[PDB]
Ligand binder design. Structure first.
Ligand SMILES: Nc1nc2c(ncn2[C@@H]2O[C@H](COP(=O)(O)OP(=O)(O)OP(=O)(O)O)[C@@H](O)[C@H]2O)c(=O)[nH]1
Ligand SMILES: Nc1nc2c(ncn2[C@@H]2O[C@H](COP(=O)(O)OP(=O)(O)OP(=O)(O)O)[C@@H](O)[C@H]2O)c(=O)[nH]1
Ligand SMILES: Nc1nc2c(ncn2[C@@H]2O[C@H](COP(=O)(O)OP(=O)(O)O)[C@@H](O)[C@H]2O)c(=O)[nH]1
Lengths: 433, 72, 219, 49, 428, 46, 440
């Protein structure tokens, strides 16, 4: 009954998805043929048809072939019901005005129909989990499209969005800045909890904790996978202070607009190093507020924790957690806000972190801190500058105003992210009265 | 009295008064014309005459008015 | 308050809720009859002569041979109406056409039951009065009419059963409305007396089958 | 006897194919049938299992 | 015969009730499958206080288990004494409370409360002479805070002359498992003020201090926390269930502990509690039990009673034990500590003495206190509420769910109204 | 009904839009952009 | 005990019957030699062959089929191929001159050299009968044989077997592609003359099965083999309730009684659920709600006319497999709450339910093994558009007397075209009259 439906848009989505579904399978047990070698701990991500066919519950979507055709011809070929994987013919060519206008109004209908069939088999959809990549059309345009229509249809549900926000420096495209400022609405008005990640930081986590000096994308999307699992762990497996998707939101999203939380896993150590550490509840809790093990390039010592929700999993006994949370409240470098006294929603599941043939060591204790910091304005700003630097010379704008988007959009988009920064920037200041 | 003079300052009463589209959706609203099922998604809005439309793909059977209608 | 037979019904001092009301002893919604349609078209050989001696329905054609088969059961459905320039027409058409007859009313008896039951179905007191005069005049009108209506006592009687005990309890004071014979309990009493009298050799079994309480006459 | 799972005991166990051989007594609904023979398909299936 | 309908609201109330039913099934002699394998005839004499009889000698507990999420109640079934409960008053729902008093009081809680009340009426008159109802719930969170108070209000409307006890787990300031605990706690205390007859406040850190220091446990678990609550629940309703003299029931305890109608927030304590290492160092006597009951660290509410005045104190002893030293200890503590007891109530300590001790124990005691130290708990919740509500923080969901802005202020008004008698009687 | 005092063309214009939020991070962002930049180092001069 | 006689007229009828009898032989369990397996069981074994097969008391299953054509190389295929021994040689009946897409060369001139002998074989097959359920004719509204000889056959059968049921399986012409130019002429004439002899006529168009095969079966290049296999699955789902045992067994007379409001209005639209394609089959539940909704979906209907553009009058569901009546009841309630499904206001109970415990049998081919299926036969007013389409086509061709001499010079009169066209116009007004709501 506790079913959640995933929607992977874009190469980022399709790829991050393959990563998440190897874990979901390795977790519940569903092997790469649907069969579960030798109890309802699967209804969330897997829909079972008579005769263990544990079919998935997602809709991988890309406006170009390739990306998805690797899953259609890969090891997990006999799992994703052919239809679920929905593909087109031409990419949006990093043009939001292609995913949201031209090459995009051709797949929006079929995807929303597959999403219905999945959301018609569920007895209680608890929320939709999206995975885009502000940067391309199938990650900014088609998302906006899908989200704008999903909200109207599946209204009183949820839309926990996971995104790969442009980095503060590297980036991979010259039109990334534009697309992101343009996808602001999909994250501000048509979402419920936007967890934003950035490749640079997950790459720092890798070149520092896992000891991998040449991190690929695979390594990165596996880290995104363990973060998602921890969030959807108190719906499949069992625990003491279990917490659902609806609960996270309450003890996080403070005001309706303020809903851009940041994520940080805890024991991101590697086999060898994890022989010199005790990885106790305090080691993991402290190394989650650490201004480096964070997943977005943003020092939290520049903002005010508005509400951090900590989701543990494994040999965590309520007592240790309570003791640890207290230590954090002693350290005064981790200043909180003055309007959220009790600023911690603890959640404890049991299933210890599952390990895929890869890197992150097998541990008996982990945590994932979904926190709502005020230090996210720095990311908002880094991007604001890049957009403002190019929109002045109206560079790379012809492509957009030639696929539909009338200039007016860019301008509105700008104002939106502007107001957004005001909201955050001015919400941690102390009581003037 | 301090609660009123504090609640109606500005930089948080604006945040409390404003609400996003999704927040507006989940405030016990009531939308009658929608899609409760795929049998409504295929049928109530399709814009495809089965008598007139000839030889169309799976993605051409369902073309919504909101799909061919302007944004927002 | 408790709705029904739930656990809330047995709650010490528990105020139970009553059942919904019943359609008996209540007015029914009227419908447009074919009387209005046929009259508005105007194939009727009738005209109100507007006499000062009481309203009379003047007849252009002879009453003794009109049809009595597409007309008399058609004038019977005018007993579902209250408006003045149709109710009088139905009243003094049906009474006059039952008065002038003989060997022509009898084959019409199976074709005049449905308008009678539809007249009785709507519970207006005045129209129930008028159709009870109609049934009395019909049973006293011709020969073997009651003997042909005795296989038909089982569907015009049940509404004739609902209002049997509706006499006025005026006490020693006398009822000053015996002229306009309106008291439908007394009218039902007289109608069942006329039915059993001019019904035939076997009518009390059907009559007692429909109306439960009845003391037999002609014993 | 129509096509349905024939009970074997009082507690409601259906007859399986693991106790259906040639030349046996099987009771159902009061009667006691004496299974005598079978065909080549039933033979090869039973010796296969 | 007098008998109590036991209701569990929320995950906290459900696990607390499960531990309670385990403890009292051990106390009475009822196995997991409902039959009786005991040793004395005194256990089945008053089995009709908590156990409804069925066919074949099966004693089904008179408990209604409620939660908006069917995930902890499945654990209640799969627990040790899980296949003893009736599956019909096992009332559930397929939703999520959201840690929302609004969603537990004016949304799916209000849609499931009729289904609760039907079975509640059913075992409320599978009855001859009902005494009261016993709600176990968490004061901060969903379900137990919201639907618990909704059930309290509807039950006080339906049966207005019956005793209502509520064992409530009140939020703690050392840590928090929920950020809207001030909202839920204030809105639930507002309903608790004019409704229930006996509230028993149980903070989590007080149980933590008893586990860490008094019992010297190394890994205290939520079951170990719940065991003390089960012990004090069995201690309170003991003279109502087992023979003896000075038989105090729920109404007698309410009369002798509630001087004014709004002052019924108690702070319970169970005190034959010692460690394994210091277990054999004891000289277990009535002075030792009085000593441990009035030591201000075995209290199960995080409210130091030396910071205020006792109004009333109840002591329910269990065991074969002489009355002279009982009366001597109750008189002696009052004579010794004259600045910690009020002077307008002479002899403000009650005595009840049951004969049958809890199994494994020969002489136990349950302490109940209506002290003025609860004002610290209430004003602390009020300070957190004013820190969160002054900014309208986390309020959009309540207001969009169906709360009004006025109702939070009116709940705060009655909440700090409650703090005023318990300080005027602290300073005369 | 209607009135004369509704044929009047109102002089209501949109009030001018407030200026955008300059942000308290703009100087830090510009300094970070200028940081790590050394002109003409690997390719070198023509 | 409850037998039906199948008659396949024309090339389309013979190929549809080839698919049908292939499905029957692998469904009941009969080897292509006409006999039974000796070292294999069957599918359970009963008198559940009698309706479509007849024992000769030697183990030989001879079917109750008459494959009539005025042209060889279509019956020569079934006398040469793998089913050459199943059919009795006198049953497969062949002329020597093609009907040439002419209703005249099937009804008036070249029907007389074969109609006596066809009725003689029909009389023999009706003599070997205990209780006749009826006849199942298979034809098209296209070619000359499938129009005219079907017409003459119905004329003779209404006289010889006037108290007997006759069900047409007619390939309705497509509104756009077609195959011949004289299809509107032949269709108007044959429905004119079969409109008073067909007790019920299931029309099945070719374009809609093409659309079903490309959109659900994922066949970018389907052919007549696939189309006739799916029509054969339809016919098996229709007349399987009198072959096997189910919860709510429903007969051909009950089909007629519950599907036809007025005696000229006997044209149900047939649709099938699981039209799924093996590698898309085992991932869904294929639950009863899904298979009930997929029938009312306006993309699985097999005549190119939108059911939204009309009003439903009486729909008959025929479920096969592990189908519990509670799921049928819940699916019917869910469909009836839907506003866009419009039933006529003079039919409150618009559903006729049949349930069978026999799962669908699969030929080696396109369709997949499913444990649930349903055939939906919806009598509705959406067919007025499909009638008026080729009515307008008839008007376009007849306004200049194009291709009319090829009919006129062979016995047929000029005024029969006007008679048939007017009876179509009367059918149009009858459909509108039965369709519109009641205000009196
Ligand atoms: N984990 C992970 N992240 C990726 C992957 N591919 C791309 N990204 C991130 O996504 C950003 C842009 O890629 P996308 O938005 O997905 O491009 P797209 O959606 O395919 O859009 P088109 O190129 O127009 O088809 C890059 O900056 C990457 O940081 C991937 O395979 N795995
Ligand atoms: N479904 C299906 N339809 C067919 C098939 N063969 C022909 N048709 C349709 O039937 C129409 C004509 O078929 P027939 O009536 O059998 O042709 P005929 O009776 O041999 O007439 P002639 O052309 O004169 O020989 C064509 O327009 C096709 O659309 C088939 O194998 N399957
Ligand atoms: N004594 C005791 N307290 C518990 C137990 N389980 C949970 N709690 C406390 O209950 C508090 C909140 O529970 P809550 O979320 O309101 O549960 P809910 O009522 O189902 O929503 C937590 O802070 C726990 O400390 C238990 O089993 N025993």
């Amino acid at each position: 009954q506790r079913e959640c439906i995933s929607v992977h848009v874009g190469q980022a989505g399709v790829q991050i998805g393959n990563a998440c579904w190897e874990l979901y399978c390795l977790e519940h047990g569903i092997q790469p043929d649907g069969q579960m070698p030798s109890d309802d701990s699967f209804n969330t991500f897997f829909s079972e048809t008579g005769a263990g066919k544990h079919v998935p519950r997602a809709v991988f979507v890309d406006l170009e072939p390739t990306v998805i055709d690797e899953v259609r011809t890969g090891t997990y070929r006999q799992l994703f019901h052919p239809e679920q994987l929905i593909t087109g013919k031409e990419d949006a060519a990093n043009n939001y005005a292609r995913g949201h206008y031209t090459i995009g109004k051709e797949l929006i209908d079929l995807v929303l129909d597959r999403i219905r069939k999945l959301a018609d088999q569920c007895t209680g959809l608890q929320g939709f989990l999206i995975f885009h990549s502000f940067g391309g059309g199938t990650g900014s345009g088609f998302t906006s499209l899908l989200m704008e229509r999903l909200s109207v249809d599946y209204g009183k549900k949820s839309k926990l969005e996971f995104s790969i926000y442009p980095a503060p420096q590297v980036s991979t495209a010259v039109v990334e800045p534009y697309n992101s400022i343009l996808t602001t609405h999909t994250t501000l008005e048509h979402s419920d909890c936007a967890f934003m990640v950035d490749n640079e930081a997950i790459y720092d986590i890798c070149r520092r904790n896992l000891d991998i000096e040449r991190p690929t994308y695979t390594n990165l999307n596996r880290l995104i996978s363990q973060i998602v699992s921890s969030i959807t762990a108190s719906l499949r497996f069992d625990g003491a202070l279990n917490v659902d998707l609806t609960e996270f939101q309450t003890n996080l999203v403070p005001y309706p607009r303020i809903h851009f939380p940041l994520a940080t896993y805890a024991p991101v150590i590697s086999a060898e190093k994890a022989y010199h550490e005790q990885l106790s509840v305090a080691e993991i809790t402290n190394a989650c507020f650490e201004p480096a093990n964070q997943m977005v390039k943003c020092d939290p010592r520049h903002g005010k924790y508005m509400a951090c929700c900590l989701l543990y999993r494994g040999d965590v006994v309520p007592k240790d957690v309570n003791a640890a949370i207290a230590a954090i409240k002693t350290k005064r470098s981790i200043q909180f806000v003055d309007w959220c006294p009790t600023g911690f929603k603890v959640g404890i599941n049991y299933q210890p972190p599952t390990v895929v043939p890869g890197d992150l060591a097998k541990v008996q204790r982990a945590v994932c801190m979904l926190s709502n910091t005020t230090a996210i304005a720095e990311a908002w700003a880094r991007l604001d500058h890049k957009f403002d630097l190019m929109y002045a010379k109206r560079a790379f704008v012809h492509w957009y105003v030639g696929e539909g988007m009338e200039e007016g959009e860019f301008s509105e988009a700008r104002e939106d992210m502007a107001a957004l920064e005001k909201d955050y920037e001015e919400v941690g200041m102390d009581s003037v009265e | 009295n301090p609660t009123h003079l504090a609640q109606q300052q500005e930089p948080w009463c604006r945040l409390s008064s404003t609400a996003t589209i999704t927040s507006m959706r989940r405030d016990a609203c009531f939308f009658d014309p929608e899609i409760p099922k795929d049998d409504l998604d295929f049928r109530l809005s399709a814009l495809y005459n089965h008598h007139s439309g000839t030889f169309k793909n799976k993605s051409e059977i369902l073309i919504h008015q909101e799909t061919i209608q302007d944004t927002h | 308050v408790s709705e029904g037979f739930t656990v809330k019904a047995m709650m010490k001092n528990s105020v139970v809720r009553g059942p919904p009301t019943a359609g008996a002893f209540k007015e029914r919604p009227t419908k447009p009859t074919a009387f209005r349609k046929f009259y508005e078209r105007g194939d009727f050989p009738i005209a109100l002569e507007h006499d000062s001696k009481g309203n009379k329905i003047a007849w252009k054609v002879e009453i003794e041979k009109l049809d009595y088969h597409h007309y008399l059961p058609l004038f019977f459905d005018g007993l579902c109406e209250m408006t003045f320039p149709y109710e009088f027409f139905a009243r003094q058409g049906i009474h006059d056409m039952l008065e002038h007859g003989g060997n022509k009313i009898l084959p019409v008896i199976p074709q005049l039951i449905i308008p009678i039951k539809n007249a009785l179905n709507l519970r207006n007191r005045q129209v129930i009065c008028v159709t009870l005069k109609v049934l009395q005049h019909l049973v006293v009108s011709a020969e073997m009419v009651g003997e042909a209506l005795v296989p038909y006592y089982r569907q015009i009687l049940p509404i004739l059963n609902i209002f049997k005990n509706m006499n006025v309890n005026s006490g020693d004071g006398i009822d000053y409305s015996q002229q306009k014979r309106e008291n439908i309990g007394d009218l039902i009493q007289e109608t069942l007396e006329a039915f059993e009298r001019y019904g035939g050799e076997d009518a009390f079994i059907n009559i007692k089958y429909m109306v439960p309480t009845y003391e037999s006459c002609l014993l | 006897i129509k096509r349905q799972r024939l009970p074997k005991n009082d507690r409601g166990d259906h007859y399986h194919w693991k106790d259906l051989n040639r030349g046996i007594n099987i009771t159902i609904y009061g009667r006691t049938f004496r299974i005598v023979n079978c065909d080549k398909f039933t033979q090869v299936f039973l010796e296969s299992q | 015969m007098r008998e109590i309908v036991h209701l569990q609201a929320g995950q906290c109330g459900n696990q607390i009730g499960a531990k309670f039913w385990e403890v009292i099934s051990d106390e009475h002699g009822i196995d997991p499958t409902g039959t009786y394998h005991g040793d004395s005839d005194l256990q089945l004499e008053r089995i009709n206080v908590y156990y409804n009889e069925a066919t074949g000698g099966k004693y089904v507990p008179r408990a209604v288990l409620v939660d908006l999420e069917p995930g902890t109640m499945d654990s209640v079934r799969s627990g040790p004494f899980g296949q003893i409960f009736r599956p019909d008053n096992f009332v559930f729902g397929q939703s999520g409370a959201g840690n929302n008093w609004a969603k537990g009081h004016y949304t799916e809680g209000a849609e499931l409360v009729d289904s609760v009340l039907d079975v509640v009426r059913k075992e409320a008159e599978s009855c001859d002479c009902l005494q009261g109802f016993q709600l176990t719930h968490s004061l901060g969170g969903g379900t137990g805070s919201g639907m618990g108070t909704l059930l309290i209000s509807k039950i006080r409307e339906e049966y207005p002359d019956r005793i209502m006890n509520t064992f409530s787990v009140v939020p703690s300031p050392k840590v928090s498992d929920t950020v809207v605990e001030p909202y839920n706690a204030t809105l639930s205390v507002h309903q608790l003020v004019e409704n229930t007859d006996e509230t028993y406040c149980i903070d989590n850190e007080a149980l933590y201090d008893i586990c860490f220091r008094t019992l010297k446990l190394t890994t205290p678990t939520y079951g170990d926390l719940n065991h003390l609550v089960s012990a004090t629940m069995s201690g309170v309703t003991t003279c109502l269930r087992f023979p003896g003299q000075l038989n105090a029931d729920l109404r007698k305890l309410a009369v002798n502990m509630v001087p004014f109608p709004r002052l019924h927030f108690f702070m319970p304590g169970f005190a034959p509690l010692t460690s394994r290492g210091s277990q054999q160092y004891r000289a277990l006597t009535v002075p030792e039990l009085t000593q441990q009951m009035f030591d201000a660290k075995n209290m199960m509410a995080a409210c130091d009673p030396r910071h205020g005045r006792y109004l009333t104190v109840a002591a329910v002893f269990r065991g074969r034990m002489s009355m002279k030293e009982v009366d001597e200890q109750m008189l002696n503590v009052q004579n010794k500590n004259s600045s910690y007891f009020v002077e307008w109530i002479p002899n403000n300590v009650k005595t009840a003495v049951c004969d049958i001790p809890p199994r494994g124990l020969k002489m136990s005691a349950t302490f109940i206190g209506n002290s003025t130290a609860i004002q610290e708990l209430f004003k602390r919740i009020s300070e957190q509420f004013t820190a969160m509500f002054r900014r309208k923080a986390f309020l959009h969901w309540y207001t969009g769910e169906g709360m009004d802005e006025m109702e939070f202020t009116e709940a705060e008004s009655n909440m700090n109204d409650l703090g005023n008698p318990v300080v005027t009687r602290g300073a005369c | 009904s209607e009135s004369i005092y509704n044929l009047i063309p109102s002089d209501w214009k949109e009030p001018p839009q407030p200026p955008r939020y300059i942000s308290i991070f703009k100087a830090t962002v510009k300094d970070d952009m200028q940081k790590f930049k050394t002109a003409m180092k690997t390719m070198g001069p023509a």
